[PDB]
Amino acid sequence: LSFHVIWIASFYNHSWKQNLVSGWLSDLQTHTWDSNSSTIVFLWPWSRGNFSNEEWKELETLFRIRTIRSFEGIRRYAHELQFEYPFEIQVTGGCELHSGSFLQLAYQGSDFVSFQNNSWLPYPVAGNMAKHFCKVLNQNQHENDITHNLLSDTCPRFILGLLDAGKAHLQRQVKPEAWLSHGPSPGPGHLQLVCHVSGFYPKPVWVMWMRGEQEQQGTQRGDILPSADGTWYLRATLEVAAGEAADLSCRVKHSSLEGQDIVLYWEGSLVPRG
Amino acid sequence: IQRTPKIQVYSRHPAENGKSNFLNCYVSGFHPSDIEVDLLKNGERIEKVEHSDLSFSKDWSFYLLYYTEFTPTEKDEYACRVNHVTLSQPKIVKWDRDMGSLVP
Numbered sequence: 001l002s003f004h005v006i007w008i009a010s011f012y013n014h015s016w017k018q019n020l021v022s023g024w025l026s027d028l029q030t031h032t033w034d035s036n037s038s039t040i041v042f043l044w045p046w047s048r049g050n051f052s053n054e055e056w057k058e059l060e061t062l063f064r065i066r067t068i069r070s071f072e073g074i075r076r077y078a079h080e081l082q083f084e085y086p087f088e089i090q091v092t093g094g095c096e097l098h099s100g101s102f103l104q105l106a107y108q109g110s111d112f113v114s115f116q117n118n119s120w121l122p123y124p125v126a127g128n129m130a131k132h133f134c135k136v137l138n139q140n141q142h143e144n145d146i147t148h149n150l151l152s153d154t155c156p157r158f159i160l161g162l163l164d165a166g167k168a169h170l171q172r173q174v175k176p177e178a179w180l181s182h183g184p185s186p187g188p189g190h191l192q193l194v195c196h197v198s199g200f201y202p203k204p205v206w207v208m209w210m211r212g213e214q215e216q217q218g219t220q221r222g223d224i225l226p227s228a229d230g231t232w233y234l235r236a237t238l239e240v241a242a243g244e245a246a247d248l249s250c251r252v253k254h255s256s257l258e259g260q261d262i263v264l265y266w267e268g269s270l271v272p273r274g
Numbered sequence: 275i276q277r278t279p280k281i282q283v284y285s286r287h288p289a290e291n292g293k294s295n296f297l298n299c300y301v302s303g304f305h306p307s308d309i310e311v312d313l314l315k316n317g318e319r320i321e322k323v324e325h326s327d328l329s330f331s332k333d334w335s336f337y338l339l340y341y342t343e344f345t346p347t348e349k350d351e352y353a354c355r356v357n358h359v360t361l362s363q364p365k366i367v368k369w370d371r372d373m374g375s376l377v378p
């Protein structure tokens with residue numbers, strides 16, 4: 001929900017790093033950072049919001065300065081914090097509105113520290129190094145107040161000119177298509193039937209193998225997977241005894257179909273007929 | 275702690291010989307973020323494959339989508355080849371498509 005920013009900082013050795021930053025509206029990517037130019041890149045025309053051209057330049061300079069001090073601070077205190085190269089630091093921070101806000105940092109892919117109200121606190125399991133890291137992070141209270149204001153002030157502001165300006169994207173309806181295939185891993189004397197569902201948006205979707213009106217509770221639904229065009233994909237499989245795949249159908253329900261379910265039948269060359 | 279990639283291969287549309295389509299390789303759940311992903315046609319690397327910007331899930335494991343526009347024919351097989359620090363050697367996952375009726 002709403003908006004968050006993610007930061008991927010890879011410290012390969014003391015003299016080599018990589019830095020990736022991107023902004024997300026709900027689950028949609030809306031911005032990227034080009035660290036070559038130190039520029040915020042707008043993936044959609046509406047990802048600017050109503051924010052003035054020059055208000056973005058200030059955010060860019062703040063981002064750019066906070067990044068270079070971040071990489072230098074981490075490398076200065078790496079041995080103090082027992083950070084051994086190579087290591088990765090991930091951050092995600094953002095907000096909601098109506099409401100809520102968050103900012104969390106991981107070291108080597110595990111919870112490390114997070115920002116609560118006005119200061120950084122260590123996750124208890126992260127141990128003494130997380131406490132020592134919070135000493136450096138809480139060095140300057142003014143910098144912390146600025147971090148607070150980005151989460152509780154700037155971030156809801158940003159949705160306020162973004163979710164309205166681009167809900168037309170998040171609320172569009174794109175009908176799925178579906179198709180059937182043979183699954184590659186059946187057990188002996190059995191078949192795996194595969195129902196592919198592709199091209200749908202938004203994400204929520206219903207898919208079941210059926211025998212007429214009877215849902216087949218052996219239907220194993222996969223993860224929903226992304227398509228390059230922003231739509232979603234799902235595979236739903238059913239294991240059946242051979243010959244017992246007669247009268248089976250895959251049924252897809254989706255908001256975009258307005259009750260007109262897609263129904264495909266295990267039939268024709270799939271069976272195969274005579 | 276290191277986490278090995280999950281690898282899922284899929285097309286955007288049902289396979290129809292001679293119809294352009296998109297081939298996808300979704301790699302997810304891995305850590306650290308360095309990874310090598312190639313799409314293969316008949317065992318050989320496809321040039322100029324696209325991928326999404328690196329991102330990560332709530333549990334901090336990374337994920338990427340690799341894809342390319344392609345046109346299958348009956349004689350072609352496609353796959354996704356992934357290398358990662360967790361892998362002794364690159365893992366190849368085939369695109370599973372049906373050829374249709376086998377025997378005339």
Ligand SMILES: CCCCCCCC/C=C\CCCCCCCCCCCCCC(=O)N[C@@H](COP(=O)([O-])OCC[N+](C)(C)C)[C@H](O)/C=C/CCCCCCCCCCCCC
Nearest residue numbers: 007021022023031066069070073074093140150154155158
């Ligand atoms: C990409 C598209 C973005 C679109 C955004 C539009 C809407 C934005 C809405 C919400 C955004 C929320 C973002 C929250 C960002 C969290 C910032 C926390 C980082 C604080 C860094 C300290 C500041 C500073 O500047 N830190 C430095 C200054 O400290 P100092 O003691 O020298 O004080 C200055 C005194 N002076 C004399 C006046 C100059 C100091 O070196 C810290 C080092 C900390 C070392 C650890 C690094 C921390 C890792 C976190 C990095 C996160 C980077 C975020 C980028 C995505």
